[PDB]
């Protein structure tokens, strides 16, 4: 899926229950492969230290 | 470095020894990962002989005819910090000092395990 | 230069919905933690000084090196001046579509004696000449050419053992900025090589030994260091993902958008 | 870089209720996620990125 | 014609001196203390202002 | 009353309306305008045609299929055969313009899908053959849209564009294209995208045939889906209006 | 602009949003608050944990089937094993709290059904066996919902709750439950109900394990219906935040 | 900065008992000689300036040295930056639990020709590169690696015969002070190596020859000198009694609290 | 540099191949112009053999006995940016890789053409 | 922007000049003339003051 547009898509569906997990990843904005190639991540990888809050918007 | 670099383990003939080698990386350590296990047998005068290697994304067995097919890695995911190995069907002729060498430049660490195998299964 | 403080907030029950928006609009939300949780007040003193464009770009980097000998076939070095042959500085510059800067040039010149059979080697100290030929100027075709006379071309002469030679260059474009990207042609029929202009033409550098030293063979190496100064830049871009292939174009081999992990809930990389 | 003394924590997402659709609408759907920095964010100590590399000078 | 300016220091001021020696501006030292910022041209480039506490679309 | 979902935009003898819109993105905060005296270099008196060329032109439509990778249009060139904007391009050495871009795609409350609409300054693209550079016919669609691909273009000794969508033809990560001016058309929220783009260049004016300085791209991130019995043909339609156009250097017509 | 259908509620490190709500019911006009000096009787200095305990806890979900009679939850007890609210319940003789209750259930514009959401002070229930009283396991669901029944529970020599829905387990007419604080979740209008409940008791503080002083009830008056091809699994989900919590009488942990 | 004067006192007969106290309380007595004997008045001019924490710590010390060759197997040096490998400076720093300082780094680089059979050796002058890689940066795995390009890593280039190279480093911790002692773990399960944090992580230094000189073999040695500057320190400790054993922990061999003498009235040491 | 440096051309026996080599100069390129065409034949193991040269204002033929009189420049004015050549009366024994080398210091460029000659005249 | 300060001398005053050349404080020379002292946090860290001429315990 990293060789297509599907890497950016988060699947959801109608289930026959509730409370199951949708995704999870760690807050490692420069080192996690989830985050390392974003704008934020690509800038972080030129630096040794980071501080501050982060926003995740879902559509 | 490796958690407990000096230890000694006692087991009986026929049982299968777990040799723990668990390591932690520093933020400076950014080279490629290398993992080596070598041996210095008690009975024998041969010394510092590789038994199993891991490098460049893959394993290499078949270095010690004696441990042929009886030395394996225990983790499904080695590079997460686990380089432990299993030896199986233990006999007296392998009593010795096993050595675990983990490399990831700049960092380098080693661990010595002294394996004693006893005739009867008994910790006395 | 400081970063913003954290305003302390208490519980809330209202029609205000700061955390609901519409990303369709092209707008990035301005939410802060106090919008969605109770926070204490924090006096933040952290600064953003190390990420100004100037501080991000103003370090020396080796853009190129080559070799020349005191005897034999290759008696001088010749290099068309460019930033696109060394990956690390090219990538940093291509964060931006257009950019103005001055340059500080530093040269690191070193020499090594080569194996030989010649006996009684007592070499004298080596001096070096570096000549900069602007575009259009005549160029030397041999190590002993009248061109090295340098009536109007700037040249630096330098003797081994002293501090490395250094000089400044002003922003040198015929355009109002250097362009890192050009989606077009130089010929009006568009039947030529794509992506080529002359807004970044900077000239050529030539380097030679002035004297040969002694009877033995000697090879020298010249390393060229660029440091940009007084930087202005415009129109940020996505950083280069694929590895570089050519110096004169953007050609790439396709690659995935990141590296993989085992599952969508996995907490480690693979 | 990855470092246990400065571990960041975890981000997860769970079904609170279900996805519910009428007949003749697709029961599978997709979400997209975006990241950015808050106005309290900063970085320190410039270094070289591990993402770009080279074996010879390009031509 | 010396200029005195503040050094970079920590938080919980001390000064330094400079004199230009050469005749061209391109000979001067780098400009490392320009801390202005203006992210609103990249974030929020919308014609109608969007008040954060309101719905974005109504 | 009032609603911030409705919008009307009038230019020259043309007008566009929309009832489900998001907002309007303005460039980098900069509205288009004519070049000023203290930034000009060309000395002749420019022509400013002003309604004959600053108006909406509607291009050929394009079908959104469930597997569509996406489309792109180089902007001066897309309009180069089209009206008096095209004629003024053909008769002058130099030109300068901004744009109002408007992308339209409607579908029912039972369809789903999501498109990125971006305006990319200086979209220099890569060739499939590493030594070569792509030919003009491969890069310039010329009032017809050019298509992205789903898989990498095979290397030969050709002059094809390396077309694969997730590198945007540019050797970058496609999810980072939001640093540029853009909107999303998300079928459950929105049926229109509008971007106002100012003139951008390292020089005050430029030749319009030699250099295409912005590129519109339209890329589905969430594929089109629907259920049987729903309408299967969903087109996308682009309309573009030049703004504040000027031309310098009058001579005989052509580009060679 | 603005809409009175949207709402956000933030407490501690938690926040809840909703886009199709009705209003918010406040108790009997009384917002929760700490106990005052001139109404206190216990003399020791109370602990007030204030974000560790005043925050939203989400319980286990429950399925709305076409024949569901309804559900109930006793309030202190529902949260008794849950976080530092549970720990403070376990270590103190005395406690005092209000609540923000939020009930969530979404469905399409093609589903129909109607639920009553009520908060009942002192919901003392009846036993199926007239001489007996019901056991604790029958009354206290303990973070799992307890279910009503459709028909009368048979009498034996047991300790079961007389569970039949139209008497609300209380020997009353269920349609008269609107004298208490309440809302309706009506699937064509509304996907959320919110009630803010103040502390209610005949004494200023009470033991939290011995006495459950309010009971949430959720009862379908108009059954869930839909047509084939529509989604069949429709859950209901309750989230509860204690407000202005205080505790007195610290000693070793337990309830016996 | 001066020390205190001596107040002159005469004989005394009273209820005041300055010389009787109770050491149980944790208090150190403030007695002066005038409390227990007749004293003259003394105008003392002695100063305490040489025992400020700054003057006590601000001297250059060699923390580490290593070697590298111009040919063969070990062509470059590599050192994780730390104060805990040299006894003298470690011991001085461990007087204090927490400390802030800046550093002045000085490098002393020297070379020696090695025995060989090669005839006609006419070596040119040697230049050296020292690169500092912050933690997380990529590291060179060979002497001819693109990493030595140093686009963003600070590097010093230095030619033999000139003054030793020197540079300053600011206080570099993610914490508010460096910690000399850590009674805990980095992993939340406490099943790891004890005493390890990353509050003192400073990076790595790499050193190489830029040119090889001549045809003969040459070995160089780089010595690294740390001088702390602008020092602040907190929570004094008992100085280290037992000899140091490891660089990464406090492990020791037990030893007596002092050396011995013959008897409790003996006036000399043994 | 040269416009399309990598290409492949297919023709039939008896026809005459056009090998395009069109170049553009940079303002830095102020040395004298040199143009070389060399060959690496497919059938044969000889490699990198000059077939036609242009230097110091004049042409030099007569370097490959095989192409004698059948290799010429196509432009009346070569130094304007055209170094293309014609090969005539093509036969199978010349299938190979032709190389065009243009020099004008500092600039240097090359182009590789892979000429395939087929039995029958047909692009299939 | 020169600063003049006193040198270390003997007892029984003479001055020196300094000018900072660099843009960071960490480039400055050492701080060798800070002679403040405060031993009462280590000696005498007691809640009740202890007057030296009195008995410590009564």
Curated annotation (Swiss-Prot), chains B, I:
Glycosylation sites: 86
Disulfide bonds: 21-100
Tissue spec. comment: Expressed in pancreas, brain, heart, small intestine, testis, prostate and at a lower level in liver and lung. Isoform 5 is ubiquitously expressed. Isoform 3 is expressed in heart, lung and pancreas. In skeletal muscle, isoform 1 is found at the neuromuscular junction and isoform 2 is found in blood vessels. In cardiac muscle, isoform 1 and isoform 2 are found at intercalated disks. In heart expressed in subendothelial layers of the vessel wall but not in the luminal endothelial surface. Expression is elevated in hearts with dilated cardiomyopathy.
Coiled coil feature spans: none
Residue span, Ig-like C2-type domain: 1-114
Top-level lineage group: Eukaryota
PTM annotation: N-glycosylated.
Domain notes: The Ig-like C2-type 1 domain mediates homodimerization and interaction with JAML. The PDZ-binding motif mediates interaction with MPDZ and MAGI1.
Main function: Component of the epithelial apical junction complex that may function as a homophilic cell adhesion molecule and is essential for tight junction integrity. Also involved in transepithelial migration of leukocytes through adhesive interactions with JAML a transmembrane protein of the plasma membrane of leukocytes. The interaction between both receptors also mediates the activation of gamma-delta T-cells, a subpopulation of T-cells residing in epithelia and involved in tissue homeostasis and repair. (Microbial infection) Acts as a receptor for adenovirus type C.
Assembly: Monomer. May form homodimer. Interacts with LNX, MAGI1, DLG4, PRKCABP, TJP1 and CTNNB1. Interacts with MPDZ; recruits MPDZ to intercellular contact sites. Interacts with JAML (homodimeric form). Secreted isoform 3, isoform 4 and isoform 5 can interact with the extracellular domain of the receptor. (Microbial infection) Interacts with adenovirus subgroups A, C, D, E and F fiber proteins as well as coxsackievirus B1, B2, B3, B4, B5 and B6 capsid proteins.
Protein name according to UniProt: Coxsackievirus and adenovirus receptor
Species of provenance: Homo sapiens (Human)
Shown chain mapped onto the complete sequence: 21 to 144 of 365
């Amino acid at each position: 899926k990293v060789n297509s547009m599907e890497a950016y898509q988060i699947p959801v569906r109608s289930n026959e229950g509730s409370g199951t997990q949708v995704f999870g990843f760690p807050l490692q904005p420069g080192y996690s492969s989830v985050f390392s190639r974003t704008l934020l991540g690509e800038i972080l990888n030129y630096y040794t230290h980071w501080s501050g809050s982060i926003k995740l918007t879902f559509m | 470095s490796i958690t407990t670099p000096e230890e000694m383990i006692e087991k009986a003939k026929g049982e299968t020894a777990y040799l723990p080698c668990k390591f932690t990386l520093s933020p400076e350590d950014q080279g490629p990962l290398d993992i080596e296990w070598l041996i210095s047998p008690a009975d024998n005068q041969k010394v510092d002989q590789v038994i199993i290697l891991y490098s460049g994304d893959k394993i290499y067995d078949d270095y010690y005819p004696d441990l042929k097919g009886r030395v394996h890695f225990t983790s499904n995911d080695l590079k997460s910090g686990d380089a432990s190995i299993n030896v199986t069907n233990l006999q007296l002729s392998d009593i010795g000092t096993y050595q675990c060498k983990v490399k990831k430049a700049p960092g380098v660490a080693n661990k010595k395990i002294h394996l004693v195998v006893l005739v009867k299964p008994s910790g006395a | 230069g400081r970063v913003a403080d954290t305003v302390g907030t208490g519980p809330t029950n209202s029609e205000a919905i700061p955390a609901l928006t519409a990303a369709e609009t092209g707008h990035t939300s301005q939410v802060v933690p106090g919008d969605t949780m109770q926070t204490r007040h924090v006096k933040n003193y952290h600064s953003r000084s190390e990420s100004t464009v100037e501080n991000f770009l103003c370090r020396s980097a080796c853009v190129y090196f080559t070799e020349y000998k005191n005897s034999g076939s290759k008696r001088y070095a010749e290099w068309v001046v460019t930033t696109r042959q060394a990956a690390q500085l090219r990538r940093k510059l291509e964060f931006f579509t257009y950019i103005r800067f001055d340059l500080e040039l530093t040269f690191v010149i070193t020499s090594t004696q080569q194996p030989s059979t010649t006996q009684n080697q007592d070499a004298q100290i080596l001096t070096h000449q570096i000549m900069y030929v602007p575009p259009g100027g005549p160029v030397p075709d041999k190590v002993d050419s009248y061109v090295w006379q340098t009536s109007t071309n700037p040249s630096v002469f330098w003797t081994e053992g002293n501090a490395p030679p250094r000089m400044s260059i002003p922003f040198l474009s015929i355009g109002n900025a250097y362009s890192n990207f050009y989606d077009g042609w130089s010929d009006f029929s568009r039947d030529g090589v794509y992506g080529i202009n002359t807004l970044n033409s900077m000239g050529t550098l030539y380097a030679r030994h002035v004297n040969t030293g002694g009877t033995g063979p000697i090879k020298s190496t010249i390393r060229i260091y660029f440091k940009p100064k007084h930087v202005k830049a415009w129109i940020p871009r996505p950083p280069r993902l694929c590895q570089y292939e050519k110096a004169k174009n953007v050609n790439f081999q396709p690659s995935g958008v990141t590296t993989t992990r085992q599952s969508i809930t996995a907490m480690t990389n693979t | 870089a990855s470092d246990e003394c400065t571990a960041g924590g975890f981000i997860t997402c769970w079904y609170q209720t279900n996805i519910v659709v009428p007949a003749d609408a697709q029961s599978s759907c997709y979400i997209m996620c975006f990241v950015s920095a808050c106005n309290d964010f900063s970085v320190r100590l410039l270094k070289d990125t591990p993402f770009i590399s080279q074996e010879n000078f390009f031509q | 014609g010396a200029q005195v300016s503040t050094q970079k220091t920590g938080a919980h001021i001390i000064h330094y001196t400079n004199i230009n020696y050469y005749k061209d501006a391109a000979s001067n030292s780098a400009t490392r203390q320009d801390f202005a910022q203006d992210p609103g041209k990249f974030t929020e480039p919308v014609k109608d202002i969007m008040i954060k506490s309101l719905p974005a679309l109504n | 009353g009032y609603s911030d979902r409705v919008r009307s935009i009038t230019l020259g003898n043309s007008t566009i309306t929309t009832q489900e819109c998001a907002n309007v993105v303005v460039g980098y905060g900069v509205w288009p305008d004519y070049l000023k005296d203290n930034e000009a270099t060309a000395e002749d008196q420019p022509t400013q045609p002003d309604v004959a060329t600053c108006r909406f032109y509607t291009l050929d439509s394009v079908q959104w299929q469930k597997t569509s990778p996406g489309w792109w249009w180089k902007l001066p060139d897309a309009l180069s055969n089209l009206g008096l904007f095209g004629q003024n391009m053909q008769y002058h050495y130099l030109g300068r313009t901004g744009y109002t871009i408007h992308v339209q795609c409607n579908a029912s409350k039972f369809h789903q899908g999501c498109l990125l609409v971006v305006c990319v300054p200086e979209a220099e693209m890569g060739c499939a053959t590493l030594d070569n550079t792509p030919s003009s016919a491969e890069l310039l669609g010329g009032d017809a849209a050019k298509e992205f691909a789903g898989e990498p273009i095979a290397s030969g000794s050709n002059k094809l564009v390396q077309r694969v969508v997730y590198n945007a033809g540019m050797g970058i990560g496609v999810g980072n294209l939001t640093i540029f001016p853009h909107q999303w058309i998300n079928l459950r929220t929105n049926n229109s995208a509008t971007i106002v783009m100012p003139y951008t260049n390292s020089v005050p004016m430029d030749n319009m045939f030699r250099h295409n300085n912005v590129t519109l791209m339209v890329i589905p991130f969430v594929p089109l889906d629907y259920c049987p019995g729903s309408t299967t043909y969903v087109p996308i339609t682009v309309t573009i209006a030049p703004m504040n156009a000027e031309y310098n250097g009058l001579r005989l017509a052509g580009h060679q």
